[PDB]
Write a protein that binds this DNA or RNA. Structure first.
Ligand code: MG
Lengths: 486, 742, 750
RNA sequence: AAUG
RNA sequence: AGUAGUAACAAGAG
RNA sequence: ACCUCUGCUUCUGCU
């Protein structure tokens, strides 16, 4: 009965399979290349590579974050006492007067002698947090008899093009610093030789992550989300000042307290998990917002003073932004240290795959080298259209930065983009292994990929890097067509 | 008394008329329903609820009673508990600082009898503490996913039988109908009632710990090396995919696990040493430095009375009185004379299926024992002939009769299979069929005793014919003799006849053979105890993937000397002492033809100057065996080279394989998943050097694919061509080449 | 001017060996906001669109509009068609029975023997269930209990006999009841006078009455499936709807899924119900079998496949024929039992949801339009997409706010029977004696197809015939997601085979946090998770020790228990520092009391109290291990044993930990949001139950460990146990001659 | 060899 | 405003 | 009622 049902079905019901070649691999996302669309702005929570911390040396202790911010501002009292706003950049639907009044309220409340960091509900605080903006719930008959109450058209994300700052963040966060912001606790003493091997390998794998800038940014995010969740559940009907802090250790062991800004919490009676609490963040920086003004249309920037780092005069700008979060993003911000593991294991497995080829441990022989083995190098960059190799530790920092940008710029667009471009990665891999892959409907694959590229900066720069990497994979495959040369 | 309090509480509950209707209407089964009635809800995101709730004021609930009142309302400003009672427990709600107040200033309770309740945990810690660690080695490890026991047990019982044991230990007045498990487990029940004597731990925790230490947890885990439970509890720190750690736990290792690990060790030593030159020397050499987890191999060979075939050969090689004691489950046999031979045959079994069971040529005689019953047995192929059993307990006679019926592979037991017997795993790996038949007929042998075939009994004054109840009758089963005399079962241990040759064959004092090196099993299994070789090159006693990867790593490391003294020296490179461990995993019917093919390929590459360095690495380790040709003075032609074990253990000659892949774009070799960069060891023009010159034996490349020779030719077609002939050949998918033989 | 490209790692490492860097599983999983009525109406529209060329009719039971695609016309294009032909399905099942003889009879007999000894309390083990009495989603043991206590008011007593078969008999006999009485809750308002404005104080108290519905209303409530949105689903941009069935289909879906499990366990190609390393061993054996079987010179290929529209394009009318084909040699009563779940699934009625919200932006007002009132408003007051959906829902919209959904199996609940149908598609292996052979692997909607043939064109001909064959059974293979390469690397259920299954550490990365049971269980769960990922998922020693450090840091910041010599502040650290100054054995304190972390790789499998019992103060170990601490409470054995963790891909898996019951085994408070709703009487209704059960375990102490069996009342068993206890008290001197008279007089009253 |  | 993204929150209830 | 409850507790019908 199957042979007779297949003999009478139409010949139009088929897979129509097409043999995949390199020429069928067009670049994904052409609309990110055209210049009519605006370039994608900065929409992260806190500043990442444009950050600037106000250091203050301490003696390896803990204290209240109010007293930490109070001492860090007492050191830099010139920036604390500046009561004259020099407006540089203003967001469109913002209020430069209300945001400067809120900054002065945060400074005057974080620097008094009371132990309470609560903020009074003035008109500028009620504007910046948003008070009475929820709609009234009326009954269904009173609204069914109405004719003006229509169902709203829900907003679709915009379409943006490649902004040049995402490459700048990727380049700057992968570079080493001299500070160590990690707070890794102790484990038990070692008895088995596997524990000694793990500790010796951790002393390589953890320092490279620890000195880079991305770990400092990660710890800033983790500590701010922890204190913000605690103050959201603790004091619900209160506006509270929450200082953005981090504790940092230099190369000689002297601790410091970096204060990156202040942040106001709204009124968080968060019942549902997707309910939003409004956070108004004021953050210090030294980056002129008019160099790259297509990056900050969401920020209101003031110029509040100048600093002398060693002998040079860097300006200090204040970036003010209304923002928001929910309980789910705060919970995933507390669990944001796991970007270590996904970066460490993927490299550590590689080290283990070296050791089975060589018989001994190859962590020093991959990070630094030895008498026999050369150091390990990976293609990791691009300079003037050519390749750039780097060390094992630079590749570890690059994967750690990638796994941090998965958290910071991570929404449903990134989920859909990764899940739909993984198939295209596996098709490119099947072309590289000379397995000879076949596709049935390739344009459906591209059409399913391209619907998630709307306004996420990591998705647009990932499409840009995929096009660049695919162009590098096409021109290197020409030695595979030249085999047997008949 | 606590009885009149419950009667007063029952008189109290009858006044609540809702509780009166609930007590009168709900049956005792439906209690299991109404216990789970609440106003709660299974939280779909519990980590978010914990992080959100720990920041609140009073996130916990207290049990209502006198112990929650000992926590004060506040402690130095910190409000510990509040007056708002909970919905579920009807007790007060406390903060998480009340837990630390209890741990710091609370009442001190009587923790008497604590180390006897959690004795499984303290025994786990004792096995960790009294342990020793060894070296850690880096190298390939092939893990096999096997169903193993997670934690060791006090006594392994079925879960209903263990539930009956726990109900007899803890709640004896509610055990219900008595089973026969109470009489078997009476000393365990008395011991476990002595140990849990005066403790105040609630009986639900005692039942959880007793169920933890009696009921087995068996799961699928990746296991390489040791699979006993004291090693499965440290499997996370034992070995990985690319490293191994030598470890020996505390306590005391068993005897069955010691004997099985000794059998695995002797089988591996014999399986390595057979393909060697002067096999007895390497057999004694490897056997002298083998350690079964704490102790040398000779101590286990001189202390344990078992071991099947390979153990006798290693015993007589070290110098030891052999013990020819087989153990078919619980059937302890010892041969007298007779030498069977194992050969696979597709038995068409009784339920209507085909199984490749091994049957034995020859005619054999045994002294058999099961439990406290003994006997003598004599058989041939699929034919139970004689069975003279001594008189003992009835069910022990039953077990011995069933085991001797199963052992002889008699067709009245093959066709007597009428039931549900699964000769395969749920994960689709091979179970041993004879042990399946043995475990089936140990319970349901009424079909066997129905269709076994009856006859009359010998009516001598010393013999007694048996019915199915093992009593005196005459409608007897065919071939069962019950004499009242003695038999002296295992006392006649006397054979001072080791006298081994080179090829590991135990030749007797008369002059014949009783054991052979072509007699051991081929079914490699994982040892229960960890097994170490304190030697250089332990890896030669490894699996197929490990041997392939280590041999290819060794060829790759020493590539310059091999290639230079192959271009200069002629016939030293093949007979190399590092390739015996590679012929240890090639089947002995194919290894000589493989060697002739690979030697002809490499000779063809060196004579006319076309050299593919990937083909050299690929077909170098196959060259060690002495070659076998065809009858035309021509070698064989192969498409793949098949190694021992599995179906993915093959080396494709033309394309890549699982075990061997080569990428010419990146110049990267892949051996078993590991990537060795060949960049810097290949020549200059080796990407325009022809590939079909190194594919067949005596077949160069004559040009591009031409349709005047017809279609592609297979290996049997190329094996029957004239010398000086053109043909067409597909190398891999996309490269057809016109090829001249010779 | 060097610019970093993170894809360039794939130049040096293969992609399958670096696939953990292609999973963004540290970001937030996408949650749905607001209603899920749009996705429900989209599911209804897409289900009736893929089967609109079949037989339409109006049911003479309920009145709804039913569509029948089975034995409909053959498709003419590559749209997803649900027109499954019956003869093709029966020929596939007959070839599957010929390949495995005796399988169907053995599976049916095992399922019947398992049904004959199943109790009603098996229906308390599935998380949320649609309650028809209150028309909501409830826990299963409350939906079941309300069903039983409402069945008692109608002379339906299949729950007293204790078996599952009399309860299912009363379920299918309640469909013939002309009226149904149940317990519902209304509200009565009340005036309180005071000194106030705008009148008086309004006190509306909810109280419990008996509400009665008609026959057809009860039949429509029994066939209903409530619908929600799938929250926290990774790997998709746009959301989808899920369903939840009532308690009157659970007893039958239990037996049909048990029968399909007995079939799936014995098939070499079903990747179900196996899981973990058992699934890895089975699929590795299958691939290694099919790789050593290609012809010499022939080409083997592997299709990495996905199935599009799997839930909408199947049919209960095909599953009815499958349960009539599999149970051929069974008794007639079992054939009537196993043919009720596809009958209730072929007549199901989708409840839509919460409706849509209409807002006035100028006046800043909003209101929630429910699903009965969806069409009591002009369609020009919806947006474009919702108005387009409401134009197409209208031929299937029941007037009480639900929708008729006859074709398609919404959200599943037949994940092993659809696996059986896919395996029956896989076992045909050839059409028309052409020179190829296929086989493959099949989980619930996920396949992997291996084809051995002469050359690649014959392989694509075999793949084309597999596609056309699967069209005949209702299996619409996706084309935008399936691809095909040579044999040696593929993907199946997020497992990536490249000459062996590679490790994917990222998919187990969200499970590495604090699990959230209590302080005692979370440390055991965390160390067990690190241990299991060292064994299974390829985590090395350095990453495992980094995971120990990160877990103890997250544990301390979650539970607010830092070290005592640290100087952190808080309401709990003020007493942790007091504990640190009093304790001499400071290395014996737990981590939850400010002690040091003591774990490393060698002791991940030992509990924390057992690791530190020989280092504790006797006062600290006395207070921590108190027999009667007020934090532990009334214990059940699975609460001590297990805790449920949900993976990022798949249903929830319970894992079992080892922990000592100390003062850190506390329980969180009950969510008190019910104190303001209309369900406050269900508080009292719970605390009427609990007292009774808390007396029962007083009389029968084994009731927590053993399940109590018996058809007698709960008062008779307790009265007999108390009478025997009093008799054996007076016959041992442990009572008086007067207190025995008091006890026996009270029992004479009872 | 197992222990579902 | 803003978070966000096919629909919500920007407190709800008495 | 500058009073109280709530922070995962589900809205067919009482509306
Ligand atoms: Mg798939």
């Amino acid at each position: 009965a199957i042979e007779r049902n297949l003999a009478r079905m139409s010949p139009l019901v088929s897979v129509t399979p097409k043999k995949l070649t390199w020429e069928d691999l067009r670049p994904i996302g052409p609309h990110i290349y055209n210049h009519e669309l605006p370039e994608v702005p900065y929409n992260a929570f806190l500043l990442m590579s444009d950050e600037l911390g106000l250091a203050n040396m301490t003696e390896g202790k803990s204290k209240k974050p109010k007293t930490l911010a109070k001492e860090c501002l007492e050191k830099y009292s010139t920036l604390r006492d500046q009561t004259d706003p020099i407006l540089i950049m203003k967001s469109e639907k913002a209020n430069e007067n209300f945001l400067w009044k809120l900054w002065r309220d945060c400074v005057n409340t974080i620097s008094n002698e009371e132990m309470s960091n609560e903020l009074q509900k003035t008109n500028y605080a009620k504007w910046a947090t948003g008070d009475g903006l929820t709609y009234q719930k009326i009954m269904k008959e009173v609204a069914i008899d109405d004719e003006t109450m229509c169902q709203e058209e829900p907003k679709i994300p915009n379409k943006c093009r490649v902004a040049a700052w995402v490459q700048t963040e990727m380049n700057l966060l992968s570079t080493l610093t001299s500070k160590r912001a990690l707070d890794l606790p102790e484990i038990g003493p070692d008895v088995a030789p596997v524990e000694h091997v793990g500790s010796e390998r951790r002393k390589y794998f953890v320092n490279e992550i620890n000195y880079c800038k991305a770990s400092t940014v990660m710890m800033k995010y983790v500590l701010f989300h922890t204190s913000l969740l605690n103050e959201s559940n603790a004091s619900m009907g209160k506006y509270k000042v929450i200082p953005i802090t981090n504790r940092v250790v230099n190369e000689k062991g002297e601790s410091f307290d970096m204060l990156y800004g202040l942040a106001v919490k709204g009124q968080s009676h968060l019942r549902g998990d997707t309910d939003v609490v409004t956070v108004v963040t004021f953050e210090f920086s030294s980056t002129d917002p008019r160099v790259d003004s297509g990056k900050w249309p969401k920020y209101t920037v003031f110029r509040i003073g100048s600093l002398f780092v060693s002998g040079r005069e860097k300006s200090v700008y204040l970036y003010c932004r209304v923002n928001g979060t929910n309980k789910i993003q705060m919970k995933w911000g507390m669990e944001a240290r796991r970007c270590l593991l996904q970066s460490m294991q993927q490299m550590e497995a590689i080290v283990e795959q070296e050791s089975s080829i060589q018989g001994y441990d190859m962590t020093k022989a991959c990070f630094k080298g030895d008498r026999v083995n050369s150091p390990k190098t990976f293609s990791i960059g691009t300079q003037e259209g050519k390749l750039v190799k780097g060390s094992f530790g630079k590749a570890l920092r690059v994967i750690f930065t990638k796994c941090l940008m998965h958290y910071v710029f991570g929404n449903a667009q990134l989920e859909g983009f990764s899940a739909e471009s993984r198939r295209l990665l596996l098709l490119i891999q099947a072309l590289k292994d000379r397995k000879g892959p076949w596709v049935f409907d390739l344009e459906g694959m591209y059409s399913g990929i391209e619907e998630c590229i709307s306004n996420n900066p990591w998705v647009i720069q990932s499409a840009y890097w995929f096009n660049e990497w695919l162009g590098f994979e096409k021109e290197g495959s020409k030695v595979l067509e030249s085999v047997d040369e008949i | 008394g606590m009885t009149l309090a419950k009667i007063e509480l029952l008189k109290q509950l009858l006044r609540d008329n809702e509780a009166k209707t609930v007590l009168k209407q709900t049956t005792v089964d439906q209690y299991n329903i109404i216990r789970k009635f609440n106003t709660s809800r299974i939280e779909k995101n519990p980590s978010l609820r914990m992080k959100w709730a720990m920041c609140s004021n009073f996130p916990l609930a207290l049990t209502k009673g006198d112990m929650a009142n000992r926590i004060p309302l506040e402690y130095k400003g910190i409000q510990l508990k509040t007056n708002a009672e909970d919905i579920g427990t009807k007790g007060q709600m406390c903060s998480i600082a009340a837990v630390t107040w209890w741990n710091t200033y609370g009442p001190i309770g009587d923790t008497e009898g604590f180390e006897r309740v959690y004795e499984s945990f303290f025994l786990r810690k004792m096995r960790l503490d009294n342990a020793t660690w060894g070296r850690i080695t880096f190298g390939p490890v092939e893990r096999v996913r096997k169903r193993v026991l997670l934690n060791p047990l006090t006594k392994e019982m079925p879960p209903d039988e263990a539930s009956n044991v726990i109900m007899e230990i803890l709640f004896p007045k509610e055990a219900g109908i008595p089973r026969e498990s109470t009489w078997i487990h009476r000393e365990l029940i008395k011991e476990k009632r002595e140990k849990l004597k005066g403790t105040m731990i609630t009986p639900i925790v005692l039942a959880y710990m007793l169920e933890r230490e009696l009921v087995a947890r068996r799961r699928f885990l990746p296991v390489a090396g040791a699979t006993s439970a004291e090693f499965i509890e440290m499997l996370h720190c034992l070995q990985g995919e690319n490293w191994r750690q030598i470890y020996h736990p505390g306590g005391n290792k068993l005897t069955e696990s010691r004997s099985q690990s000794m059998i695995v060790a002797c089988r591996k030593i014999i399986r390595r040493s057979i393909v060697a030159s002067n096999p007895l020397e390497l057999a004694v050499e490897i056997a002298n430095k083998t350690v079964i987890d704490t102790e040398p191999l000779k101590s286990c060979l001189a202390a344990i009375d078992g071991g099947d075939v390979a153990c006798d050969i290693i015993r007589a090689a070290l110098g030891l009185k052999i013990r020819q004691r087989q153990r078919f489950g619980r059937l302890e046999l010892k041969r007298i004379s007779g030498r069977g031979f194992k050969n696979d045959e597709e038995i068409l079994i009784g339920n209507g299926t085909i199984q490749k069971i091994g049957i034995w040529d020859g005619e054999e005689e045994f002294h058999v024992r099961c439990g406290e019953c003994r006997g003598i047995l004599k058989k041939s192929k699929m034919k139970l002939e004689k069975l003279l059993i001594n008189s003992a307990k009835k069910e022990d006679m039953r077990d011995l009769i069933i085991l001797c019926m199963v052992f002889s592979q008699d067709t009245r037991m093959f066709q007597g299979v009428r039931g549900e017997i699964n000769f395969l795993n749920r994960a689709g790996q091979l179970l041993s069929p004879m042990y399946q038949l043995q475990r089936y007929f140990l319970n349901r042998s009424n079909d066997l005793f129905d269709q076994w075939g009856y006859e009359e009994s010998p009516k001598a004054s010393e013999l007694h014919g048996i019915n199915e109840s093992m009593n005196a009758s005459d409608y007897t089963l065919k071939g069962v003799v019950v004499t009242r005399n003695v038999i002296d079962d295992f006392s006649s241990t006397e054979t001072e006849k080791v006298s081994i040759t080179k090829n590991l064959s135990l030749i007797k004092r008369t002059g014949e053979v009783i054991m052979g090196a072509n007699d051991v099993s081929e079914l490699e299994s994982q040892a229960q105890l960890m097994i170490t070789y304190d030697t250089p090159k332990m890896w030669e006693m490894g699996t197929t993937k490990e041997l392939v990867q280590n041999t290819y790593q060794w060829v790759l490391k020493n590539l310059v000397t091999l290639k230079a003294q192959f271009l200069l020296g002629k016939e030293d490179m093949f007979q190399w002492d590092a390739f015996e461990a590679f012929e240890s995993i090639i089947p002995q019917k194919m290894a000589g033809q493989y060697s002739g093919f690979a030697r002809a390929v490499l000779k063809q590459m060196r004579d006319q100057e076309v050299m593919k360095t990937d083909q050299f690495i690929k077909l170098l380790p196959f060259c060690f065996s002495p070659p076998k040709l065809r009858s035309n003075g021509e070698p064989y032609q192969f498409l793949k080279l098949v190694l021992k074990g599995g179906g993915e253990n093959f080396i494709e000659v033309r394309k890549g394989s699982p075990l061997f892949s080569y990428n010419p774009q990146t110049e990267v070799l892949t051996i078993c998943g590991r990537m060795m960069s060949l960049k810097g060891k290949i020549e200059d023009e080796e990407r325009n050097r022809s590939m079909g010159n190194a594919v067949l034996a005596g077949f160069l490349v004559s040009g591009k694919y031409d349709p005047d020779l017809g279609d592609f030719k297979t290996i049997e077609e190329l094996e029957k061509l004239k010398p000086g002939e053109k043909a067409n050949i597909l190398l891999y998918q996309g490269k057809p080449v016109k090829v001249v033989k010779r | 001017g060097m610019n970093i490209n993170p894809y360039f790692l794939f130049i040096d490492v293969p992609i399958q060996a670096a696939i953990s860097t292609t999973f963004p599983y540290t970001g937030v999983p996408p949650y749905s906001h607001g209603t899920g009525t749009g996705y429900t109406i989209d599911t209804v529209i897409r289900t009736h669109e893929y089967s609109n060329k079949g037989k339409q009719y109006i049911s003479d039971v309920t009145g709804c509009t039913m569509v029948d695609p089975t034995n409909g016309p053959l498709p003419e294009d590559n749209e997803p068609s649900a027109y499954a032909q019956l003869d093709c399905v029966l020929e596939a099942l007959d070839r599957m029975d010929e390949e495995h003889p005796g399988l169907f009879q053995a599976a049916s007999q095992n399922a019947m023997e398992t049904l004959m000894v199943t109790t009603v309390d098996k229906l308390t083990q599935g998380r949320q269930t649609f309650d028809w009495t209150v028309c909501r989603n409830q826990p299963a043991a409350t939906a079941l209990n309300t069903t039983i206590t409402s069945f008692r008011l109608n002379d339906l007593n299949g729950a007293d006999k204790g078996g599952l078969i009399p309860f299912c008999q009363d379920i299918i006999d309640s469909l013939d009841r002309p009226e149904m009485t149940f317990f519902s809750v209304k509200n009565i308002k009340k005036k309180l006078p005071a000194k106030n404005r705008k009148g008086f104080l309004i006190k509306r108290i909810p109280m419990k009455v008996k509400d009665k519905i008609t026959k057809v209303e009860y039949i429509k409530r029994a066939l209903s499936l409530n619908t929600m949105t799938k929250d926290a689903e990774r790997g998709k941009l746009k959301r989808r709807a899920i369903a939840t069935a009532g308690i009157q289909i659970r007893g039958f879906v239990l037996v049909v899924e048990n029968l399909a499990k007995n079939i799936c366990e014995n098939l070499e190609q079903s990747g179900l119900p196996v899981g973990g390393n058992e699934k890895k061993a089975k699929l590795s054996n299958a691939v290694a079998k099919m790789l050593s079987n290609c012809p010499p010179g022939g080409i083997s290929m592997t299709v990495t496949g996905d199935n599009t529209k799997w839930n909408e394009c199947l049919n209960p009318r095909i599953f009815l024929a499958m349960t009539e084909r599999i149970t051929r040699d069974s008794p007639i009563w079992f054939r009537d039992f196993c043919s009720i779940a596809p009958v209730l699934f072929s007549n199901k009625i989708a409840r839509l949801g919460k409706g849509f919200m209409i807002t006035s932006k100028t006046k800043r007002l909003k209101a929630q339009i429910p699903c009965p009132d969806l069409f009591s408003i002009p369609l020009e007051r919806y947006n474009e997409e919702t108005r387009a959906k409401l134009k197409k829902l209208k031929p299937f919209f029941n007037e009480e706010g639900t929708a008729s959904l006859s074709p398609g199996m919404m959200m599943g609940m037949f994940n092993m029977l659809s696996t059986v149908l896919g395996v029956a598609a896989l076992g045909i292996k050839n059409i028309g004696n052409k020179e190829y052979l296929w086989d493959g692997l099949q989980s619930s909607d996920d396949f992997a197809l291996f084809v051995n043939a002469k050359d690649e064109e014959t392989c694509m001909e075999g793949i084309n015939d597999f596609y056309r064959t699967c069209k005949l059974l209702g299996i619409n293979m996706s084309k935008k997601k399936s691809y095909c390469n040579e044999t040696g690397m593929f993907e199946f259920t997020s497992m990536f085979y490249r000459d062996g299954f590679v490790s994917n550490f990222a998919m187990e990365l969200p499970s590495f946090g604090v699990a959230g049971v209590n302080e005692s269980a979370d440390m055991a769960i965390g160390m067990t998770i690190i241990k299991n990922n060292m064994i299974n998922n390829g985590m090395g020693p350095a990453t495992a020790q980094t995971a120990i450090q990160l877990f103890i840091a997250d544990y301390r910041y979650t539970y607010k228990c830092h070290r005592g010599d640290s100087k952190v502040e808080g309401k709990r650290m003020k007493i942790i520092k007091e504990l640190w100054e009093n304790t001499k054995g400071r290395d014996g304190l737990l981590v939850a009391d400010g002690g040091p972390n003591i774990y490393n790789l060698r002791n991940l499998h030992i509990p924390e109290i057992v690791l530190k019992y020989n280092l504790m103060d006797p006062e600290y170990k006395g207070r921590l291990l108190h027999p009667q601490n007020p934090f532990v409470g009334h214990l059940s054995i699975e609460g001590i044993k297990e805790a449920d963790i949900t993976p990022a891909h798949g249903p929830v898996k319970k894992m079992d930990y080892d922990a000592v019951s100390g003062t850190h085994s506390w329980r969180t408070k009950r969510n008190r949001s019910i104190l303001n709703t209309d369900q406050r009487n269900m508080i009292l209704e719970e605390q009427c139950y609990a007292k009774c059960c808390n007396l029962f375990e007083a009389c029968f102490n084994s009731a927590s460990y053993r399940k109590p069996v018996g058809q007698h009342s709960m008062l008779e068993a307790m009265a007999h146990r108390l009478r025997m206890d009093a008799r054996l008290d007076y016959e041992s001197g442990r009572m008086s001659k007067d207190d025995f008279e008091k006890a026996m007089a009270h029992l004479g009253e009872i």
